[PDB]
């Protein structure tokens, strides 16, 4: 039943004791269901390190991943650039869900497309799809290029898309002069940030191997910036904001902040702002390159110094307060522009609220996980709160990444509790925090599952989740703020120590119990 | 719009295509005529996407994972690929259950053989086999697993057919093989087909011999309502409030022993008939189960749809029916004076699925509303037969509609609002059309049966009425 | 006992077996405590409709007040001036309280002298006081003005400030030209944000009065700004940024941003930026002035119009859209600056986020309360958003004001069940939000104990807080942010709908029970 | 530093006053002499401060309502003036409690006359005979109401000493007056003072005609300690393990019939000297009952203590307190032996009220710590007498310091740590040194006994080895 002037939806409707008594007729009548006994009995058996120590054998079994596939990466690296369409050669379920992937956390429109192909091109190959897909989308949605990428079908059968765009060209279907940068994608290899640094490494090729004859480094007084995956729109923006505060001359390399955040004013804006053919044809020509997130730029590294001749500083992800600080010591270096009395100033407001909040934070523990340089920023920024990062997840990382994340614990006291996982995922991730548990969370709204998991063993048991990293789906707008630099240093630290003091506050809300603790002032 | 006016808006729309792309499309795009029903005369459907044209469409393994098997949460599914796939679709859809999540039922989890490229090299079947045995190992109560085909599987070579009967028989497991590869069909259509004869084949024979299930006359099952933000429970309590003992649901809250103990039942009820007319065609030559369409969508809809479900029964169903009729009459009564002034002639244009873009035609006209387009993604001809008896004199229809189309349509048509998919959502708030989500209901529902309306009509009004959209426009321009 | 590894704080160190014991004698030996069915009892019937009625009877007694005295706000406006010290006149007590009551919601020092009158005074009064006050405060602290407010002694007494600062300068205890703008602040009148208004007219009279002979209007082609009794840094900072990309010249008239957020660089700094005395001099001559929140700027408004000349715009405070589109456009209008690309982009970038955002704000029922401008700016936004404003008290309110509101609810479907108190305090808000139950609070930290009180009837019964206001004491940094402009709107929506989703992730996260509506996205 | 280096100091920075102020500020200022034990010899106190000098003092009103008065939880506390006084102090001190707030117990609510200028034309009287009615009303379950004058009551003539005799008979219920108007002393000392005769004569005089109270003889109280973070609950907890009997706590979670019950017991522990000395000395004159200071800061005074005490009484309480002492021997080693290395050296300077400046020197040195600064804000020379004690040679001393004395005396010592009140800590923080609330425990503690020995040495650990104090320099400068 609903009552008219307060309609219940699903939550909660199906708390009304009819439909409970429908759902207990259903389960005892037709489900079979194993018995209460037994499903509290293997659920506590799952919260042991009985239960983790099988979980850490597994080898073939992946549960609940932290980590998508490269052309996922591809599709918001080619974004970033003016009037581009993203294309997948391939077929077209893929490009179904990367779309409503990136829809659904940023909430905006995500232009892709694909050329569909299907099960006939195993016979004879995608060609036919690369004439008429890339000839039908210049036609339909004018891009003023299209940057292609694979799904892993494509890359099974073996389509090789230098010959098949040049093929589309010499048989007319798009001008000889139109852009076409391409990057095969394979998804079996690497995951989604891998899919970024081949897509930037393909387009960064087309628009600069055949002209280095002219180049001349330096020569026209910017500095590069390669933002890598990147899923916060105030991460470009406070890029941006710092270089231009500093006097920088600067070429920001896939720029996809104007259209992941066009207006609503009445009109649709399929493409918007980017970075320009002309700043990537000019890009060799800068002092230097400077790579945000180097531990999954390793392919565009190689170009950038092998091609462009520029030397690659050695950088951290500028996140928190060592690392943003030797960034921009690095960037005065490149550039002879002082570091200027504006960001000398946010830098001291950072650290007046890392006094102010430091007794709240200390010794506090953490899970977490995300990509590699994500993660290895937060782990070092959270050294710099004096927090603990007791477990360290990083999916898709590698060896020599979790050598340089275990330097960096060991160089801190507040290390010496930490591990770092590589190759794990949140199913292994659940079992620690059931064995080892630490007071939060810092993670993707995946982590909501975990945080429900432990609730269920007992409210004493509960980790609660903190949202930062990609995706996250279960709340508005989070995707504006910002992780790199002072600024993100101080939004991370804020809701830091808010989440410390809004779970102190629900433990402490206890009438005459332990409200005696409900202090006004924290 | 007229005929005339609508036909004229298909022919500037295509002027922009090449012209092997706008020979397709042109079948594809139709002016609803009362005079003509056979829809083969009328619109081409489930044909491949034309390349580049930024088809709305998903594949087959989101249409036998995502759609069919996702849901079955007592068994564990597979997906068996790289790591994308099962990724974006974890949990994407709200095919609700309950359950503890992890121990007993594992819908909302993502297990994956996360596929490298030695496997594409080896070949996944000793991965899978491995799998197995983990799975076994660290989720005992599962009560069975499915092996959900992303697109490498069947491209090399593999045999998961094999691995699933050796360890099926290992283990005295029902492990379920599914050939749903992206590469298979046009769109999640073929995966529907591939997943119900997977049902067919390997799990609904299994009790043939069994005969300890204690039947009645009034034994039904619910078919091809996947209980979307509840949808199939706010049914289910109609059906039975009406006498009737609902034995299975396909496959929203369902459990493999349900789908096992449907052979036995009396009468399928099929709500999407596109995803399982297969199954209960199979179910009506094997079994002997007759099987019938129905609508819970609105009070007229489902009020007829319980009528014709009791005059499948004796005069104590029928009576039980008008019972139920007349407990609810107030209900949604109170939802249309409330809400009906605030809709009325309002025009909806629609792009959905397989099912609802016909579907809740009844229930947005029961609040006064005009639906003036539709279309599907990928239904077949004989979903746009059942579509044209439904829709209005000149309404346009489109089927496997383009971005750029769709876009267009609205430009010119300027209907109130819009009920399509997360893709298309967040296109048309810009332009300042009231938008809602009519798969996912926006996070929102149940929209199925009486309770279902009271939320359908608070959502279709909060939306059309809200004060944004009178704010898109700045003073100063 | 403590375990060294584990040491306990106070929660949860008294929930061991021990201390509750030890507890449970104390009380049940000495405290002569009632029985715990009679607290149950009485609690129960101060949740009812029956102790409401009896609750808004009262005439003398108030409880749990939502306002602060008038020199709070003097203090505060005199922050906002440049090597300005704030003095009140009279008791130091006063003047203890009003720096630890800053301090706490800024986390900044606060700088604020008391001429420390005591007993004696009320046969010589407070004219030696003053005298070696401001010598002793201008020697030691070194101001380049002192701003002169009293506490409710010396106004009982009935010293004469402007006498007795004359007297101090005829006597040579500070120099004659050296600024002493001064004002009776009485806290037995108005509230801290009448403060405001009485020490903003007293240091435009200062540097104006005698002057206006050469004034001419318009002359500077500025527009000033009065931001009136403001606590959040982003305020401020958000004015001066959407006026600066305006290209419209301003003076920002009390502008405290700096010097309430200097950076931990290894020095204090006592002074830091702020409005000129070159600045309020020169004011007269600008264009016009603008009142951010005229509703508590009524006696500056009236010498801005009487003496120099302004014809003061009658603008709502810049809040929500509708407000910020008015704001900008009046501002437009005077200054003959169009409304620029990035503003206009900014606004439909909000637009953008309430459209996302409607179908979870839609209808939600809200209690509110703060200072009048504040409150139905707050009132305002919630209605574009199709929220519903319940209860909305103002302790410090008017009738003038509530029919203003009154009005701007009548304007809107959203308004229809709302109800705007003056007068009334968080007692009485307390029982309206157990006998007509809202979905939350917007409101300041004293907030957190109606929670407390509501969750002690049951959770289906909890009201939760949202820390929108002013003091907030419980959380860190909140200060910082902004709720004025597009940018605030957008704040204000992310902290509402985000409130609203981590509400219901709470609801349904009980495993098997509620958790089928555990959805990962929302 | 030298005792010659401080001197020169003290002279350097009062150059900057003028005349006057600088004669009266060096009265002040001394540097310890072990030579010289009477602090009357070399330094003043408890005299008005100087106008305008920024004195981190409050007034006599926070002295009897924020600090003795309010803490009494079953009882309501009437802020009787403008809405200020009892507004900032709403809450702002960690007096703890056990109780049902609203209902039963009324600590953290601020119960307000809220002044309008026609109260202070007419005379608040009448107000106030009707708001006792009101909470007569509305919270039924008080035991008691005290009326706590700000600065207009006195000035205006009202007379609150009637209205609580009228309104006291008429209810048959306590009613307190107490005169703590803030422009009363020079400070919140007069305000114990004050609030301590009004405890003499208006409520402790009422158990006279009463005994049907069992005493034993190990009743005691404990008299002066206001539960900061719990302090007295963890003082209580030892004094019973010792055998004693605590009767009642003065006046942290403290309610009135314990208070009324204290003339009962058989000996007075008094933690607080400066605040509660007063009724002391007078239980002791009309009731005979001793009284002994303790303290109970750090194991080597916690310790001491104890055994003071418990001598007191008879060999099986000494045998207890013995067995106490073995108890928490290994707790309060194991923390010595983790945070004393990581401490020991650091210089600290403290500037708080009227007991800690002397009673946490001892705890410091328990963790190899060194208080090279100290002084009060209110103290009297009976406590700087206690104090020279306490402090080593050549020591910085300040009564009453002002804003700009602390400051220029920090930059000059440059201390590891300061601890002192919230007006202070953002100051030295952005000067780059650790800072500890030493009034608020900065939201911790208990700090009192074994159990806050941990606390505090944990706390001071955590602040002075921060990483974020080695941030402050900019790499760049
Ligand atoms: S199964 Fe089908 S696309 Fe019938 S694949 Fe799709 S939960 Fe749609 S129109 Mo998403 S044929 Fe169901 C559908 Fe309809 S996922 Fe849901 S809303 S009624
Ligand atoms: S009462 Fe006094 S100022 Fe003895 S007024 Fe003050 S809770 Fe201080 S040094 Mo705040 S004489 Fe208590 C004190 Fe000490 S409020 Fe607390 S910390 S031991
Ligand atoms: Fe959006
Ligand atoms: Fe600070």
Sequence with gaps: ?522 | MSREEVESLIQEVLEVYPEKARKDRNKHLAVNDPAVTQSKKCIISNKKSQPGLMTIRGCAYAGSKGVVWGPIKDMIHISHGPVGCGQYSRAGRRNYYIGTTGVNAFVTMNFTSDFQEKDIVFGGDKKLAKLIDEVETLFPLNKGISVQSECPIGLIGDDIESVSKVKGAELSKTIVPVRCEGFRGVSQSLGHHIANDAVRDWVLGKRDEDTTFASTPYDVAIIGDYNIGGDAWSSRILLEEMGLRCVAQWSGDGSISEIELTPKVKLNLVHCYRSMNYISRHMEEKYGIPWMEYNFFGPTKTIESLRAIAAKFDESIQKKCEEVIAKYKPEWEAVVAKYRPRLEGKRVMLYIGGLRPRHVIGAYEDLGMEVVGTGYEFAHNDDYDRTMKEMGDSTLLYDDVTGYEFEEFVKRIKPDLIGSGIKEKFIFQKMGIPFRQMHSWDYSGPYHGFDGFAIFARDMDMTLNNPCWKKLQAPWE
Tied chains: 1, 3.
């Design chain 1, 1 to 522: 039943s609903q009552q008219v002037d307060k309609i219940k939806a699903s939550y909660p409707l199906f708390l009304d004791q009819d439909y409970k008594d429908m759902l207990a007729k259903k389960r005892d009548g037709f489900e079979e269901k194993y018995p209460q006994d037994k499903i509290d009995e293997v659920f506590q058996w799952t919260t042991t390190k009985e239960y983790q120590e099988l979980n850490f054998q597994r080898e073939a079994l992946t549960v609940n991943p932290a980590k998508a596939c490269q052309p996922l990466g591809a599709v918001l690296c080619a974004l970033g650039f003016e009037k581009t369409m993203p294309y997948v050669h391939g077929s077209q379920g893929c490009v179904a869900y990367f779309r409503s992937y990136f829809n659904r956390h940023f909430r905006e429109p995500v232009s892709c497309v694909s050329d569909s192909m299907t099960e006939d091109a195993a016979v004879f190959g995608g060609q036919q799809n690369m004439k008429d897909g890339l000839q039908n989308c210049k036609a339909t949605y004018k891009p003023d290029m299209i940057a292609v990428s694979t799904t892993c079908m494509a890359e099974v059968i073996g389509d090789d898309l230098n010959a098949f765009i040049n093929n589309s060209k010499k048989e007319g279907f798009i001008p000889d002069e139109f852009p076409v940068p391409f990057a095969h994608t394979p998804s079996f290899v690497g995951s989604h940030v891998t899919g970024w640094d081949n897509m930037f490494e393909g387009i960064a090729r087309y628009f600069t191997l055949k002209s280095m004859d002219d180049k001349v480094v330096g020569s026209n007084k910017k500095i590069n910036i390669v933002p890598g995956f990147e899923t916060y729109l105030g991460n470009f923006r406070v890029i941006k904001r710092m270089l231009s505060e500093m006097g920088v001359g600067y070429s920001l390399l896939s720029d996809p902040e104007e259209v992941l955040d066009t207006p609503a004013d009445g009109q649709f804006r399929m493409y918007a702002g980017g970075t320009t053919q002309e700043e990537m044809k000019d890009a060799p020509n800068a002092l230097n390159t400077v790579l945000l997130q180097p531990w999954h730029l390793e392919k565009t590294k190689k170009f950038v110094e092998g091609t462009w001749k520029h030397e690659v500083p050695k950088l951290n992800i500028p996140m928190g307060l060592d690392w943003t600080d030797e960034f921009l010591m690095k960037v005065s270096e490149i550039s002879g522009q002082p570091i200027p009395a504006s960001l000398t100033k946010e830098r001291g407001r950072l650290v007046d609220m890392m006094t102010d909040s430091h007794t709240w934070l200390h010794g506090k523990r953490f899970a977490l996980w995300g990509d590699p340089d994500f993660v290895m920023g937060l782990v070092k920024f959270l050294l710099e709160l004096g927090c603990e990062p007791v477990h360290i997840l990083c999916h898709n990382g590698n060896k020599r990444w979790k050598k340089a994340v275990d330097a960096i614990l060991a160089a801190s006291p507040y290390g010496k509790n930490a591990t770092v996982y590589i190759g794990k995922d949140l199913w292994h991730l659940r079992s620690l925090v059931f064995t080892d548990k630490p007071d939060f969370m810092i993670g993707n709204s995946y982590g909501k599952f975990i945080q429900r998991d432990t609730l269920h063993k007992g409210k004493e048991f509960e980790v609660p989740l903190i949202r930062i990293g990609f995706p996250i789906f279960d709340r508005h707008h989070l995707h504006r703020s910002t992780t790199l630099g002072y600024e993100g240093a101080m939004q991370i630290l804020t809701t830091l120590v808010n989440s410390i003091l809004e779970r102190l506050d629900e433990e402490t809300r206890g009438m005459q119990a332990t409200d005696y603790n409900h202090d006004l002032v924290r």
